[PDB]
Design a protein around this ligand. Structure first.
Ligand SMILES: NC(=O)c1ccc[n+]([C@@H]2O[C@H](COP(=O)([O-])OP(=O)(O)OC[C@H]3O[C@@H](n4cnc5c(N)ncnc54)[C@H](OP(=O)(O)O)[C@@H]3O)[C@@H](O)[C@H]2O)c1
Ligand SMILES: [Co+2]
Length: 159
């Protein structure tokens, strides 16, 4: 099983300026529950975005995709291709925009947090991947985050 997990604004923006323009503790807890114990695969830019104290995320095989053969991600594996990372029962791709697009052919699950923030797309933004007609979706109810933004979970799946 390869799954993708991400949070997006209603516009599809998932990242700006190398970070994320919101922070929902509830979504972080959801992310932790879904990924805990499994492989997590991330692009090098997303690894860069994690603070050194939080890196690697605990209890998970942290894998970083990079074309730099000498890139060092202390506490993580650095691989040059996505296929190298797929050696575990569950693999969660945790971003960013480039790696979501790269991993989508391998994917049968997408756990998507829609954040009710009106965030027009700007040049340089990272965006959520486009899901074609093979994906079947199940939508949760809108919830209030303590941060003040509403959010809802979509669970997309396909054979
Ligand atoms: N849920 C969310 O909202 C969420 C989750 C994660 C990240 N983000 C955001 O997403 C943004 C980063 O996304 P990004 O798209 O800019 O970069 P990214 O996908 O995180 O990492 C891009 C890097 O991955 C490596 N890479 C990409 N394709 C590769 C391939 N085919 N083979 C080998 N290595 C490859 C390269 O690393 P080298 O340059 O080292 O070769 C490339 O520079 C940040 O803003 C981050 O905060 C958002
Ligand atoms: Co699990």
């Amino acid at each position: 099983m390869v799954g993708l997990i991400w949070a997006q604004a209603t516009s599809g923006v998932i990242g700006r300026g190398g970070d994320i323009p919101w922070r929902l503790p509830e979504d972080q807890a959801h992310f932790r529950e879904i990924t805990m114990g499994h492989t997590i695969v991330m692009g090098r830019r997303t690894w860069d975005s994690l603070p050194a104290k939080v890196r690697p995320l605990p209890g998970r095989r942290n894998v970083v995709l990079s074309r730099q053969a000498d890139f060092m991600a202390s506490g993580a594996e650095v691989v040059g291709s996505l296929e190298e990372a797929l050696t575990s029962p569950e693999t969660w791709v945790i971003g960013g925009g480039q790696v979501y697009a790269l991993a989508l052919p391998y994917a049968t699950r997408c756990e998507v947090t829609e954040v009710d923030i009106g965030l027009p797309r700007e040049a340089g933004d990272a965006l959520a991947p486009v899901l074609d007609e093979t994906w079947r979706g199940e939508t949760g109810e809108w919830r209030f985050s303590r941060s003040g933004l509403r959010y809802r979970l979509y669970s997309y799946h396909r054979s």
